[PDB]
């Protein structure tokens, strides 16, 4: 019964998944709202997003880390580690700053919680100090997300985790538009949370379209595994 189950046991298999951003940028208030499912007995997510409002004004895969880390793969001689599905039902605050740069910054904020069965992704997300034919704003980026390490560390004054990672954007022109992610994430509930030690999360993400669908939308594979922390279990090996 997912309106009584707590943490990790939220987590035991296919959980479905709503995504609701709210977003601002250059004059164009614009929504986005995916739909899918994630298990994080595999950390696999499949989800297709649609914008509602029309055509979306940034590239897609500008969007795609604002866009559930509580999905992510532990693994077992790491379970102690997982902010993320300690944090669940009641969820937490995944704050950020995405500094583009020689471009803009996107500011988000969302909470991550259940609500019934459902693990839901509600972020409201600004645009600020865009060039109007820049690689975001011009549409000059591919359609692709490559893969990539986020470093997690506790910040136990705060009773929550940070991340600063680049996300790297190949641009059509063969350039690369970096895109600097500074993130906090907090309880929102008052129960007691798992405070990790310094570990990452690698993902992956495959990037493609619905061929019948006629509305603005990127539909979405994507894995996350937590990593780093092995001595132990590399010491078995020996």
């Known amino acids: 019964d997912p309106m009584v ?8 298999g296919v959980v479905p998944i709503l995504v609701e951003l709210d977003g601002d940028v250059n004059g164009h208030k614009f929504s986005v709202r995916g739909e899918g499912e994630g298990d994080a007995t595999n950390g696999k997510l499949t989800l297709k997003f649609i914008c509602t409002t029309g055509k979306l004004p940034v ?4 969007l795609v880390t604002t866009l559930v880390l509580c999905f992510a793969r532990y693994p077992d001689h790491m379970k102690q580690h997982d902010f993320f599905k300690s944090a669940m039902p009641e969820g937490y605050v995944q704050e950020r700053t995405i500094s583009f740069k020689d471009d803009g910054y996107y500011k988000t904020r969302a909470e991550v919680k259940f609500e019934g069965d459902t693990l839901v992704n509600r972020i409201e997300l600004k645009g600020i100090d865009f060039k109007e034919d820049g690689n975001i704003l011009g549409h000059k980026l591919e359609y692709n997300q490559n893969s990539h390490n986020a470093y997690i560390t506790a910040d136990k004054q705060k009773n929550g985790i940070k991340s600063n990672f680049k996300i790297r954007h190949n641009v059509e022109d063969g350039s690369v538009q970096l895109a600097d992610h500074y993130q906090q994430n907090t309880p929102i509930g008052d129960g007691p949370v798992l405070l990790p030690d310094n570990h990452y999360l690698s993902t992956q993400n495959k990037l493609s379209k619905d061929p019948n669908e006629k509305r603005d939308h990127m539909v979405l594979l994507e894995f996350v595994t937590a990593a780093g922390i092995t001595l132990g279990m590399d010491e078995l090996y020996k």
């Not at 189950?5 to 035991?12: D, P, R």
């Not at 590239?59 to 500008?62: E, G, K, Q, S």
């Open 59 to 62: 590239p897609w895969p500008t």
């Open 5 to 12: 189950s707590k943490g990790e046991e939220l987590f035991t």
